[PDB]
Amino acid sequence: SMEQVAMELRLTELTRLLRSVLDQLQDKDPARIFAQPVSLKEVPDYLDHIKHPMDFATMRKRLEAQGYKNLHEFEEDFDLIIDNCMKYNARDTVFYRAAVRLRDQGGVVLRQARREVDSIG
Fold first, then answer.
1. SS (H, E, C) 59-109
2. 64-103 in b/e burial notation, b at 16+ Cβ within 10 A?
3. Could you say which DSSP state residue 39 is in?
4. CB count in 10 Å sphere of residue 109
């Protein structure tokens, strides 16, 4: 139907906007600490601690399959990256500290993303 096509164009345009959001958030992680899944070869107990791992490569795979229906879903995955890290790692670690800085800097980006999503519809 034509309605289904219009819905699909809306999803495509959200995907475009979320790709720009993802790029801007990933720039806030210049150490690439959050770029890839935590390796279960290198951290064998990880899934005992963290039940829903997340990372920017995993998000990018979902994004490119148009698997984010709205901005809430995307933000959920970004918050997982941060929150997982802040539980597994202690406060005095480069990993924790990177996550705090990513949260703080990413907030700015996400605030305007939400306005753009609502504004453009």
1. HHHHHHCCCCCCHHHHHHHHHHHHHHHHHHCCCCCHHHHHHHHHHHHHHHH
2. eeeebeebeebbebbebbbebbbebbeeeeeebebbeebb
3. P
4. 17
Q: Which domains does the chain have, with CATH numbers?
A: 1-121 (1.20.920.10)
Quoted resolution (Å): 1.4
Question: Determination technique for this PDB entry?
Answer: X-ray
Amino acid at 49: H
d(CA 24, CA 1): 35
AA identity, residue 4: Q
